[PDB]
Design a protein around this ligand. Structure first.
Ligand SMILES: C=CC1=C(C)/C(=C\c2[nH]c(/C=C3N=C(/C=C4\NC(=O)C(C)=C4C=C)C(C)=C\3CCC(=O)O)c(CCC(=O)O)c2C)NC1=O
Ligand SMILES: C=CC1=C(C)/C(=C\c2[nH]c(/C=C3N=C(/C=C4\NC(=O)C(C)=C4C=C)C(C)=C\3CCC(=O)O)c(CCC(=O)O)c2C)NC1=O
Lengths: 480, 481
């Protein structure tokens, strides 16, 4: 119930497969330190506590402070490899406030070929398939998926690269409840996340509170962050050991999220994580290319039909006489059953349309809607009173030429029934309850041609204005 | 004069620091081969000619043909490293044009990850440009490393530099469209890397020159060992430049910019570091789309308080003249202009310092003939030759047509300012010197985005005004009847 208010940013504990130290970003005096760090680094904790970073790491300090000035964001990272008698470790540092955060992990042509493979993917399906195929090759994970977040905050499993002897997760959809808001904010900032074990116990820090502020330490930028005790339980019921997610951020929005699950507890080398980090950058880029090609190809086919409607609405002195002529046919362009044409006051219908008292109720609903365009494939969801009028009007596309919904075109698609079918299964049942009655979902190539008719009709709303005044001016001349 | 029609794609010769073979992409029979390849590979040419690739490279073939199916674009590349007794271990790079596999041979022997995060945390486009160039100079060890930015009038502008001490700066340098022709720009959009190891070295021909498959010259656009033009070399010889490496920046299918790394002494880079640069090219094409998006969004934020007062008043604009001339709004200060023209319904109204009336009616006649929705110029003397003497009041122009046809239009006028650029690159510089005479303050892209946001709210009111005018006619007829 109150699982959306849990502070994920402040666990106060780390994952037991490395070491963590946080120290003041001016003095270098060691403040906070995990319990395990004494055994890991192979030094007495009394020595480490109250020691400068100029003493412990005497060569890395004049490089650490240079690359990390006070003022830089807590997204900037600095990696280094150093040798210790206790073998050679991995050092990863960053800066929060005036506190340097040190991370320690034990360390020990495929990328270039993958790059060109992604750049020469024909569509978004093939890009998704290849990306997942590459990840499974380099890492050697069992299951590797790719969610795509719908603008109603629901994930959709579009691709998979699985091991033989496991059921497919393809086509799976999960609600907004599983990924809360505070998690989504953190995943927009920090692109990588790693969980080596799900049944392992968290290692606390000593002392827990940062004496600089007397406040808990924010460890959002840390890879060794202990994961939620609810998300672990979720993966325990399925029986999943390792989890690695790489977030896809497009235009400052969380596009999608690769998830790499494993049956057995697994710890990945930090040399291969960097390769994945690179792939995350490459997959955020190419998605913006492939989805741009998905619409541009779709529009190209219908453009011959589109140009006849656009040029006729360009010199539209009559909105009724030209935009109702069957030689244009506005139903076939958008693949819809019904069309409503409301101009000047008179409402005109074309094709299969709901009854007249319901029409005047539908146009009353669109006026109350603040948006310029109304896009819905289920009108029963948005408008509860107009759910019985689905047989003729299930999917709706409405544009207001001008503003105020005085002059508007409405597209109506026929009714089609949809039923969802497949602990992930109790999350699946919440998605099952939401959907009842739907229609054919709107293609984004159609939306771009729908809003291109808006720009040529409203441009004619100015040419129409001129001659109307002229008719008034000539009338007054005849009156005088 | 006819240097824009030169076939750069077909040199018929290669650069002398490697080896090249082109063979049929089904049989594997060796067709074309450079003269140097006999000495380089350490085998007799008679043996190599009329030999299958299954015999010469017996392990790489079932990997070569798999990664390169017939049908894939000639942009896909495959790199491999293989050991040879003659010259040590070499670098193998293959691709596919038509039904002809193209083999390239060159002798081979934490900075990147840190650079990545440095680029992702750059505050602006100036700082991104500075860091990128600083990184390249560190990894490669070139003398001069620049970064051109192509202006939408096809002119390069040196924005950043990472130079060696004891050399004059190239910062602020600008060069015309003549130096980089069209056929070069097409090739640089496709193939992102280019390498010239020496400028005074002689080109090594292929034997035989013509591909017997088609009886046509071999297109080597995707090849790194392509011999560069005998005119571009001469250009770099006059300056005295040895090595040249360029990495092209392509944004949205358009050539954004081009890193250029020049060197005084002949230099050959290892192929292991070229791949790092190739990666940096990908990272710099990405982050530019982020930084330039932040440059305008920050600029608009400051002026948004002034912008919102103009937008809401033009939203319920029943009168275009009465509301969009009120000094409480002040449309001059928003766009930082001297003059403003307000033409609506037929009557032209002026605000601030404006040209004489016969010149005004000439200016509005010019904008009607212009096909574009928005006219953006900082020099009106360039676009309109008759209106060059009217620069003291109208030098820079920003015009928007609410609706279409230039019936109702707003015109912004910026005052006259002289700018002069001052410094074989010098004869190319003189062609840029002749172009500019009289200018104004150049338009900020943050202003253009607010200028076109006033278009969308005024034209939306062109529809609301329409309704009530007819209503007044309809009520009149009712009273008449
Ligand atoms: C196929 C399996 C399957 C999963 C993994 C799923 C949910 C799910 N929960 C996530 C995050 C999360 N989910 C939770 C927590 C919860 N977990 C819950 O399901 C509930 C009820 C809570 C409580 C609010 C939190 C806090 C995170 C983010 C953890 C982090 O910050 O790393 C993520 C994104 C990160 C990842 O891939 O690990 C997924 C996909 N639904 C599915 O069907
Ligand atoms: C100080 C440096 C400086 C140069 C180098 C310049 C122009 C210039 N010409 C270029 C390409 C080119 N320039 C030429 C050729 C020519 N060269 C000429 O200046 C003329 C007259 C021709 C003939 C048209 C060709 C053919 C290319 C493309 C070569 C390729 O495809 O790699 C490039 C991009 C590739 C590179 O840098 O190697 C630049 C920057 N003007 C300058 O200010």
């Amino acid at each position: 119930e109150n699982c959306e208010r849990e502070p994920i940013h402040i666990p106060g504990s780390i994952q037991p497969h490395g070491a963590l130290l946080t120290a003041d970003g001016h003095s270098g005096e060691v403040l906070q330190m995990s319990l395990n760090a004494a055994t890991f680094l192979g030094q007495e904790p009394t020595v480490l506590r109250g020691q400068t970073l100029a003493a412990l790491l005497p060569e890395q300090w004049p490089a650490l402070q240079a690359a990390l000035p006070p003022g830089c964001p807590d997204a900037l990272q600095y990696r280094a490899t150093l040798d210790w008698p206790a073998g050679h470790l991995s050092l990863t540092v960053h800066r929060v406030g005036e506190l340097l955060i040190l991370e320690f992990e034990p360390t020990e042509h495929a990328l270039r070929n993958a790059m060109f493979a992604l750049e020469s993917a024909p569509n978004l399906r093939a890009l998704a398939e290849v990306a997942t195929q590459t990840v499974r090759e380099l890492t050697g994970f069992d299951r590797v998926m790719l969610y795509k977040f719908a603008p109603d905050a629901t994930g959709e499993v579009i691709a998979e690269a699985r091991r033989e002897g496991l059921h497919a997760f393809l086509g799976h959809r999960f609600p907004a409840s599983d990924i809360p808001a505070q998690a989504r904010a953190l995943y927009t900032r920090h692109l990588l996340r790693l969980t080596a074990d799900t049944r392992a116990a968290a290692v606390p820090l000593d002392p827990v509170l940062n004496p600089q502020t007397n406040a808990p330490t924010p460890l959002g930028g840390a890879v060794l962050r202990a994961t939620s005790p609810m998300h672990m339980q979720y993966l325990r019921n399925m029986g999943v050991g390792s989890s690695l997610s790489v977030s896809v951020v497009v235009g400052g929005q969380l596009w999608g999220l690769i998830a790499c699950h494993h049956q057995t507890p697994y710890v990945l080398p930090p040399d291969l994580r960097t390769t994945l980090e690179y792939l995350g950058r490459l997959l955020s880029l190419q998605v913006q290319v492939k989805e741009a090609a998905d619409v541009a190809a779709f529009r190209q086919s219908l453009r011959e039909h589109h140009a006849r409607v656009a040029l006729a609405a360009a010199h539209s002195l009559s909105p009724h006489d030209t935009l109702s002529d069957p030689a244009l046919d506005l139903l076939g362009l958008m693949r819809a059953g019904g069309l409503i044409l409301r101009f000047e006051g008179r409402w005109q219908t074309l094709g299969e349309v709901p009854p007249a008292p319901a029409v005047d109720a539908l146009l009353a609903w669109l006026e109350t809607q603040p948006g310029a365009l109304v896009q819905t494939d289920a009108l029963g969801q948005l408008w509860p009173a107009g759910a019985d009028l689905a047989p003729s009007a299930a999917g709706l596309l409405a544009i207001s030429v001008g503003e105020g919904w005085s002059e508007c075109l409405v597209w109506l698609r026929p009714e089609l029934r949809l039923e969802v079918a497949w602990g992930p299964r109790h999350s699946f049942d919440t998605y099952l309850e939401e959907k009842r009655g739907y229609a054919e979902p709107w293609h984004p190539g159609e939306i771009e041609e729908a809003q291109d008719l808006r720009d040529t009709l409203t441009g004619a709303l100015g040419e129409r204005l001129s001659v109307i005044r002229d008719l008034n001016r000539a009338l007054t001349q005849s009156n005088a």
